[PDB]
Amino acid sequence: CMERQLEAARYRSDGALLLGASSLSGRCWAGSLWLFKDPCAAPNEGFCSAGVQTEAGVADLTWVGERGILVASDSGAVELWELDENETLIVSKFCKYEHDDIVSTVSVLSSGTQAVSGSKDICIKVWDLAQQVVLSSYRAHAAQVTCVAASPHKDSVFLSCSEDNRILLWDTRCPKPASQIGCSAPGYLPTSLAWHPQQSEVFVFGDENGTVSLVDTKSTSCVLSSAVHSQCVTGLVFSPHSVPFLASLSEDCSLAVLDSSLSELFRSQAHRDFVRDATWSPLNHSLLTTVGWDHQVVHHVVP
Amino acid sequence: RVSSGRDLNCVPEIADTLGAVAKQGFDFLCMPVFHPRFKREFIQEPAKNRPGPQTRSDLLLSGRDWNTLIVGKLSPWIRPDSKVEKIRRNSEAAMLQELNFGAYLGLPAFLLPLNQEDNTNLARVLTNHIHTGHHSSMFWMRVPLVAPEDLRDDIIENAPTTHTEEYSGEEKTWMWWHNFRTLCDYSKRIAVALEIGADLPSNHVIDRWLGEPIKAAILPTSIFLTNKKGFPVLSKMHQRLIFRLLKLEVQFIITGTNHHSEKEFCSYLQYLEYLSQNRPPPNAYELFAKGYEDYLQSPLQPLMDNLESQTYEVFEKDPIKYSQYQQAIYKCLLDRVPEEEKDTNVQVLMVLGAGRGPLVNASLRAAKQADRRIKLYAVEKNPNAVVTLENWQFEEWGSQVTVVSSDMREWVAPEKADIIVSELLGSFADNELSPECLDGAQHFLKDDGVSIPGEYTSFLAPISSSKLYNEVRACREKDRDPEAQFEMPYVVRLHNFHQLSAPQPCFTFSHPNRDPMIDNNRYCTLEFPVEVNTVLHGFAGYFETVLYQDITLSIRPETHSPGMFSWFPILFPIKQPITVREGQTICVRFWRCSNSKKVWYEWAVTAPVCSAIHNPTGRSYTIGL
Amino acid sequence: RVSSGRDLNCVPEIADTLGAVAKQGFDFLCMPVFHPRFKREFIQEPAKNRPGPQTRSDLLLSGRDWNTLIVGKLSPWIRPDSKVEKIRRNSEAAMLQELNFGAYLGLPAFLLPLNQEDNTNLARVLTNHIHTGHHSSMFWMRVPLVAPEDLRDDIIENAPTTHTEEYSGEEKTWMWWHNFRTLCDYSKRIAVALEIGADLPSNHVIDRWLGEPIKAAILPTSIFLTNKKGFPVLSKMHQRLIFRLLKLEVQFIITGTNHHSEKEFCSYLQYLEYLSQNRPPPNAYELFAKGYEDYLQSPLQPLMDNLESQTYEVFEKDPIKYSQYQQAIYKCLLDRVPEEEKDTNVQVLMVLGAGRGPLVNASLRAAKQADRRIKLYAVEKNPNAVVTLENWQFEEWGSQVTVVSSDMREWVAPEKADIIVSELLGSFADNELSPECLDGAQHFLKDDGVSIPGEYTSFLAPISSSKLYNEVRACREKDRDPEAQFEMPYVVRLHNFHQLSAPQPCFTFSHPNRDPMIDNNRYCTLEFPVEVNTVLHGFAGYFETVLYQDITLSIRPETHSPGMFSWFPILFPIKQPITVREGQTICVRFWRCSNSKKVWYEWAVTAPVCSAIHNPTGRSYTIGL
Amino acid sequence: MDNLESQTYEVFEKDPIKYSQYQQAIYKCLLDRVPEEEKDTNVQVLMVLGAGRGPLVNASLRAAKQADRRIKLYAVEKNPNAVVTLENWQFEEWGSQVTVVSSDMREWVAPEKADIIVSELLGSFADNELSPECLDGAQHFLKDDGVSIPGEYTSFLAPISSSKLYNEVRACREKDRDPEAQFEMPYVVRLHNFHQLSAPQPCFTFSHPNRDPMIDNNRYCTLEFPVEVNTVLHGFAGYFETVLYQDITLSIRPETHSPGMFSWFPILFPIKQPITVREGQTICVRFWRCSNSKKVWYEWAVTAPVCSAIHNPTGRSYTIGL
Numbered sequence A: 001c002m003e004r005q006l007e008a009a010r011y012r013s014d015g016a017l018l019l020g021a022s023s024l025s026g027r028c029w030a031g032s033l034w035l036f037k038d039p040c041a042a043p044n045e046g047f048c049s050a051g052v053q054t055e056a057g058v059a060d061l062t063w064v065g066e067r068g069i070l071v072a073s074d075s076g077a078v079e080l081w082e083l084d085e086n087e088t089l090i091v092s093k094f095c096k097y098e099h100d101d102i103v104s105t106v107s108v109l110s111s112g113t114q115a116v117s118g119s120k121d122i123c124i125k126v127w128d129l130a131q132q133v134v135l136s137s138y139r140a141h142a143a144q145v146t147c148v149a150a151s152p153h154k155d156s157v158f159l160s161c162s163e164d165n166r167i168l169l170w171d172t173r174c175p176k177p178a179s180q181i182g183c184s185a186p187g188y189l190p191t192s193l194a195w196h197p198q199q200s201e202v203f204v205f206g207d208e209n210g211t212v213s214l215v216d217t218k219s220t221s222c223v224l225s226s227a228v229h230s231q232c233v234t235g236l237v238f239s240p241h242s243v244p245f246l247a248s249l250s251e252d253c254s255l256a257v258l259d260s261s262l263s264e265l266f267r268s269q270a271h272r273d274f275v276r277d278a279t280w281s282p283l284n285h286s287l288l289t290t291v292g293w294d295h296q297v298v299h300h301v302v303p
Numbered sequence B, C: 001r002v003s004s005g006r007d008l009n010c011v012p013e014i015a016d017t018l019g020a021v022a023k024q025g026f027d028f029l030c031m032p033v034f035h036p037r038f039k040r041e042f043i044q045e046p047a048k049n050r051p052g053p054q055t056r057s058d059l060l061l062s063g064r065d066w067n068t069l070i071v072g073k074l075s076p077w078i079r080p081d082s083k084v085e086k087i088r089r090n091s092e093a094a095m096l097q098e099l100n101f102g103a104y105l106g107l108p109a110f111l112l113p114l115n116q117e118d119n120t121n122l123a124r125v126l127t128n129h130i131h132t133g134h135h136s137s138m139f140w141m142r143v144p145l146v147a148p149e150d151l152r153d154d155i156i157e158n159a160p161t162t163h164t165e166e167y168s169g170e171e172k173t174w175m176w177w178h179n180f181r182t183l184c185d186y187s188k189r190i191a192v193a194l195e196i197g198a199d200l201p202s203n204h205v206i207d208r209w210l211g212e213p214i215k216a217a218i219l220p221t222s223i224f225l226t227n228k229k230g231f232p233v234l235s236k237m238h239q240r241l242i243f244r245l246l247k248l249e250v251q252f253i254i255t256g257t258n259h260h261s262e263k264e265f266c267s268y269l270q271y272l273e274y275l276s277q278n279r280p281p282p283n284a285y286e287l288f289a290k291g292y293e294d295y296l297q298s299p300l301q302p303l304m305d306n307l308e309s310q311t312y313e314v315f316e317k318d319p320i321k322y323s324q325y326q327q328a329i330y331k332c333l334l335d336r337v338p339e340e341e342k343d344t345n346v347q348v349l350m351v352l353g354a355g356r357g358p359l360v361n362a363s364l365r366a367a368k369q370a371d372r373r374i375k376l377y378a379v380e381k382n383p384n385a386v387v388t389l390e391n392w393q394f395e396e397w398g399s400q401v402t403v404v405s406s407d408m409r410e411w412v413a414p415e416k417a418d419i420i421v422s423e424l425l426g427s428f429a430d431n432e433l434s435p436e437c438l439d440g441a442q443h444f445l446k447d448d449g450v451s452i453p454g455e456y457t458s459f460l461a462p463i464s465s466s467k468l469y470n471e472v473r474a475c476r477e478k479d480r481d482p483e484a485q486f487e488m489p490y491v492v493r494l495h496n497f498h499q500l501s502a503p504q505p506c507f508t509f510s511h512p513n514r515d516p517m518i519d520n521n522r523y524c525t526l527e528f529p530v531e532v533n534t535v536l537h538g539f540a541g542y543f544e545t546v547l548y549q550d551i552t553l554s555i556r557p558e559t560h561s562p563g564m565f566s567w568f569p570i571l572f573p574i575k576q577p578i579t580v581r582e583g584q585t586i587c588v589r590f591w592r593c594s595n596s597k598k599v600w601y602e603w604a605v606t607a608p609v610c611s612a613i614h615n616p617t618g619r620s621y622t623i624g625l
Numbered sequence D: 001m002d003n004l005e006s007q008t009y010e011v012f013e014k015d016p017i018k019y020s021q022y023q024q025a026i027y028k029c030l031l032d033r034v035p036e037e038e039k040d041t042n043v044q045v046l047m048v049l050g051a052g053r054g055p056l057v058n059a060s061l062r063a064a065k066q067a068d069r070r071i072k073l074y075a076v077e078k079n080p081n082a083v084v085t086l087e088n089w090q091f092e093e094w095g096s097q098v099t100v101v102s103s104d105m106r107e108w109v110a111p112e113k114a115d116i117i118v119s120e121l122l123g124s125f126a127d128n129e130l131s132p133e134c135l136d137g138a139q140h141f142l143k144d145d146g147v148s149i150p151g152e153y154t155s156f157l158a159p160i161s162s163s164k165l166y167n168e169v170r171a172c173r174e175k176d177r178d179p180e181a182q183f184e185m186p187y188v189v190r191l192h193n194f195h196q197l198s199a200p201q202p203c204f205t206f207s208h209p210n211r212d213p214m215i216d217n218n219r220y221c222t223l224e225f226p227v228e229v230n231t232v233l234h235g236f237a238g239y240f241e242t243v244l245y246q247d248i249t250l251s252i253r254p255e256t257h258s259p260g261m262f263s264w265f266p267i268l269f270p271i272k273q274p275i276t277v278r279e280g281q282t283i284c285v286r287f288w289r290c291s292n293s294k295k296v297w298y299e300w301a302v303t304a305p306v307c308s309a310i311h312n313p314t315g316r317s318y319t320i321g322l
């Protein structure tokens, strides 16, 4: 049986669907992890490939390679779950209690051997996944860390953002690893991040007020911006196309899809609660899957 | 033993978690009452219509467990002071919702953070909650010694942490608490959960919190060090603060995960227990005072009222006051009658205000210690104690002691005294009219006669203390001036307070007083150099007295008579708190005033700003002649 | 176990005597504080200058012994109301002297007699004492059921005892207590030590003392009878009074010498213990109420406030209310769906104000008892209980129960009801706005739909009780009308009181109410025949309700639902007590009033005299819509 | 909750500017809604919401034979005592052109919809007589393209110094209530012995009609008043401005005050304790408008250069009855 609040949806390269969800109300506050080789069968538990209960809720997750699942837990743990040989069990590889508060965000760095986590405890941590240890611990921020995002191609570079209003570009090769970046004037709080998968120099960020903006790291200047949403922007997900489209999800319960100049191509009101994640099919590049706290798994068709 | 809770921000199952932490040793648990990640919408559809339940059920704990074991926590996404209107309105409504739920549940406390400068709207919402109905939870505001922004790693290349020290800046969080608490008009329901950091800030930043209503101190696991054998312990400097916090008596709260994997959570706890086991034991004074900290008493009306038998009982047990008197009487006897006169010379000794007789006995012990001879009068105005006295001189003293039932200002003495002995002293020395009483008695002391005490002096010190300011404010009564509480002094065992400058002498009286024209009125100006930032709430008074020569009594802290519990300090409030800054001078003015019927004090602060003149005319407070 | 003291008027040695009586079983001792025969002079010489001591010393007992074991007695020569001036002045001064001494000593009580009609000056002196300082003794006025003059042997030839009975005369001593207590302005510090005689007076003389503040009952040895084996016992009629006095809970006092020489003093005591061992055990109701007698509660603001979880908890334990509801729902189901329709017909049942769900469960039990089928809505305005409810319908009820979070006056119902079920009732029936609430809900009951309750009726009875009059008076607050306390009703477990006439119906409401024009305002006149003399202090309210057909709930004493503790009576005070005489009628008038925001009651007595109209405009008390 | 007295309507009916300003607004609106070719064919439905003794009904009538256009009038009034004056007006004078309606505008079931609603429900702080709540519950009977007159209003605040007024407030202590309540309610006062410390700044703004998807009349606002003298702060003078129609306005803001208009004095919002302000400091003040279903109130607090207590929390000392 599956808890109502769907937190995460990610396609594997082979087309199978990883699902994360928490119980955010009722007697038991926990979470679970699900694998759905039939993605159209989501989220019925009987018609799943694998599935397991976690100690506490899942605030975030990400695929590690092809069989690993890296989880941001309410408990302060970062955990790594391993997919079965058959891929019919999901087995705990490590549970490490290193954060002092809810771990809110997690991301795998380019070479698949390290990860960065972000916490309400205001810390950012760099993990050796093979070693199951915290390599580095950074208190750069002054309020809870909202999102960490690895660069596509460099193991020492990642974005982070906090309710302390700072967007930070990181580079563990420098003596002083973080460097504050963003728009001319300090605007609204940064709530979501995604690197451009082609131009490894550009990213987008979403704010608390529903604006999506495009940033050059080179210009240290905000290129374009658009008011996409009427509420906070919780996720930004680029399509796997040559010229990638950008999926935009929100607490206004809608999904939008925008082109590279950030114009609206599509919008979906299908959800009736917060939209928590988007994931593009590796197979059908026009098929896009969103999940939300309504416990709906919706497969969209994008022009 | 310490009282301590566990702070958690993750609770999968309530029954399990409560058990686990109770096993570990904790007295209570701080947890979310809604899931910390469960952002609710109150206005926009469809999110607003989210099917319930909105949280987990009250049935999961007994009514008693809720009332004694659980401290609520505001959900961390609730931001009433956000610059985004919609977030401001969901937060306003969600804060109400969570606060109403804690009240429904009967929770004894509830935590809310001050984690930024502007908390106006949080303050307004909470004030509004406080003034809605009849619920009982304390509110603990989670404030750090050091702001998060001033605590960060210096690891941002283009945003360095500012190196040059700012005396003010490092007190920024006291001002967070101060403004918040002012906004909410000093509600007795709002207290401090002070969060202690790995790096302590400077003394001065920490002292700042002296006299604030600290109900709990939050210790992250991360601030603990590791000893030889792997156990958690604290730095020397952290220990000093633990001791000050134990002395104050607060509840400790452990927060964060186990950073000593070798042992369980009870290890942190056992260190705190170790610390309190290891502090000094209560001295004799501290044991007497134990129940009385910041408890406010109306001072005795010494003349218009008669003390109760049990009041004489409690103070007769003073292990220092009477043996000090004996020693004064002893030294005086020798000085007045030479060895050759010893069996020829009989000293007339009068005890003025003899109570149940201890100073009469002390006199008697002084005579067969000096080996000299004395005739005793025991004068007492309280006819009820006169019963104890007259039963003493029949069964014991014999005709050596002449018991006299009357006022010393009234008595027609058969002969003159060599020595008058009295203890007519209150905590501000002369606040029981010892001057007026001994003045009207002195006509029967021989021209070369000694008074014991020979003199006394009162002292004043400015103080900070929100707690006491609030205890006074709460003393408002029906059918009198709504501000009278502030225009009278209180005998109080000052405990949760900060003394802002060293005590300075105020009024002085000498006995006998053969001033051609006797005047007991006084006017005095005091200038108190202050070297911290703070808020002034009143003046602690104390006193010193010269019994005889070098034999003294004192409640001035610097020269306090050890073991002597007979007097607590006195507190003289002011109607309105006054902000004082580093390096400023507090100027205060006291008058002693009288007419034929009564005596009173009037006071006013004149710098760094003026207060109203307090108690003009004895309008709120007089001492009856 | 009883709490009892010994009354003595002779104490040679205090330590001995205290011991002796403690041995015998007594909890405390009533004794002189000065020698009863020791007439003192305060004005004329030489008598005035009598060398002391004036009495024995406080040192003879511990402070604790004084506070817990000794009750003072006024010296019997003290006669403040004598017609001889000099005696009047020595008495005034000696009464002060003895009273000051009891206060000095910290005595918990002190006895003074009312042994004659005129006690004005005694009253004045005592009043003056009460308003001097801060002392704590109760004053117990020793009054007999029967005056000594009405008790004498008829053995004076030329002064016969008057044979013809006088209804009034035999109540002369109640009027002694009444005037005295009025003089002293009802001080909460003055209570009754009622002296029981060998011959009881008539019932009516004794009932007179119903609702007075009796703190002790004094039993002379002389009134006890002797049984077969020589032990002391009491007449059947005396036992009845002992039982009423135990029920009231007072302290017993044995007075006089041992008139059963065969045994010791503990024998009298052991009989009293025997008596209280032998009374009925507390029924379920009496056990719930145990801590609540004459304790005054502000009634719930049912709509503007949300009940706390522990409040639902306490009342969910009612062993009768819910099983009565179940039985009403049961009978209704059968009446609406025939056996042939049983599996075809699904009744729509709405619980309006569902709290934590007990009436939803009772509905469910009623359905598989009637063996019929139902669809349930659970409406609740209190979002905190809605949490309990929504956790119930996920874990248990399933889609058979639709939980609805809103006000019943607000809800847009998807379908119409066959049956609405509610318990929105306060102690005066409609004082929680059940009428207004069900009125605005009824538009969704089908044309042939049943409301449970179908109707309710409130009832009123006039009462006597100085104790409650004083509890109300003491409810004066700062910052509001100084008489508001009297212009609002109180939920109270009426205990020390006398009910003056039988309850009479007041307001009645029916549901549904398809009155063409609905009006919930009411005006009613009641005439209460009174057959005793007494003083009126207020009106006890009660109620009855028809759940379904013959299934009822009631807190009217005559028809009280057994075991049902969910409602205490309600009290409606009047500002000023009113004297009523044998055979008079008390007339009272109640109005129920409203506007769109609130509902309130206004009341006035119109006979035998008028009171002021109480609570005009809801100036002191409204019930928020 | 109260009904005005006859003499109160009398005094203000004598305002030499307020009504002729209304007439001019009604005039301009009529022309804008009905073209010359429609003039004799088009009859505008005009509703006066809160009609008092009829001056805005007459001003409407004068506006019609000034614009030379044709109108049907409703005169709604909740005060049954003024309704007596009104119904005696429409018998003796107005005739069936004016339909007098005795009820609350929030309550009335209107037979038809309005082209134009006309009202003056304004107090010295604009919205302090519940004009928003009143026009909100009335708007369902304004046609989709209907105009409200006023179209909008805005309140303004300025900090003030004045020991005299501080003392007048202090002296307002009453028996049987909070001894500090005097300070937690505003006063209509012709401010005279006082010093205004900074220029007035806009506070709350309301628009009519308000077809906000979700209507919310609550408000929270922060104002920063630059002060360039040394002084002591004792309270905030409030004022207001309103857009009747287009460029036709009323104002009691000193800088833009409507000349001759005496119908409103300023409002005063005290603080419990005076606050010392120094040359070059900023006074920061915060106002909230609050409500529930029964009442509306204001709560305020100073946050710089020091904080005051939050005033009037919960409407504990002062509410405006719905």
Ligand SMILES: Cn1cnc2ccc(-c3ccnc(NC[C@H](O)CN4CCc5ccccc5C4)c3)cc21
Pocket: B292, B297, B298, B299, B300, B307, B311, B312, B314, B315, B316, B355, B425, B426, B427, B432, B491, B566, B567, B568
């Ligand atoms: C802690 N404590 C326990 N019982 C107390 C009774 C009175 C007081 C009390 C009340 C108001 N003022 C004072 N302090 C000033 C007095 O002058 C203290 N002296 C100390 C010596 C003394 C000796 C005999 C009789 C009375 C006294 C009182 C004490 C404190 C008590």
Ligand SMILES: Cn1cnc2ccc(-c3ccnc(NC[C@H](O)CN4CCc5ccccc5C4)c3)cc21
Pocket: C292, C297, C298, C299, C300, C307, C311, C312, C314, C315, C316, C355, C425, C426, C427, C432, C491, C566, C567, C568
């Ligand atoms: C003896 N006791 C112990 N806890 C109490 C809480 C409230 C009250 C209380 C306070 C004011 N008025 C009342 N009585 C009138 C109420 O309508 C009684 N009903 C009885 C049934 C009921 C069921 C659920 C929730 C509340 C109630 C309240 C009781 C009494 C309590």
Ligand SMILES: Nc1ncnc2c1ncn2[C@@H]1O[C@H](C[C@@H](N)CC[C@H](N)C(=O)O)[C@@H](O)[C@H]1O
Pocket: B302, B303, B306, B307, B312, B315, B316, B352, B353, B354, B355, B356, B357, B358, B359, B379, B380, B381, B382, B385, B406, B407, B408, B409, B423, B424, B425, B437
């Ligand atoms: N003017 C006065 N004349 C006579 N007795 C006084 C006067 N003023 C105060 N007293 C008594 O002086 C005593 C003062 C007490 N502080 C000392 C009691 C006793 N000497 C002792 O040390 O225990 C009280 O018993 C007062 O009643």
Ligand SMILES: Nc1ncnc2c1ncn2[C@@H]1O[C@H](C[C@@H](N)CC[C@H](N)C(=O)O)[C@@H](O)[C@H]1O
Pocket: C302, C303, C306, C307, C312, C315, C316, C352, C353, C354, C355, C356, C357, C358, C359, C379, C380, C381, C382, C385, C406, C407, C408, C409, C423, C424, C425, C437
């Ligand atoms: N107008 C209303 N609409 C909805 N609920 C109401 C209304 N008035 C009162 N209530 C609720 O009705 C319940 C009344 C209680 N006396 C009964 C609780 C529950 N039925 C029980 O017997 O335990 C309370 O929980 C109120 O909050």
Ligand SMILES: Nc1ncnc2c1ncn2[C@@H]1O[C@H](C[C@@H](N)CC[C@H](N)C(=O)O)[C@@H](O)[C@H]1O
Pocket: D003, D004, D009, D012, D013, D049, D050, D051, D052, D053, D054, D055, D056, D076, D077, D078, D079, D082, D103, D104, D105, D106, D120, D121, D122, D134
């Ligand atoms: N909700 C309401 N419904 C109907 N009348 C109202 C309402 N609120 C206020 N009023 C009336 O509106 C009038 C407002 C006055 N300021 C104006 C009087 C008149 N229009 C004039 O200018 O002289 C008063 O007569 C109020 O009684």
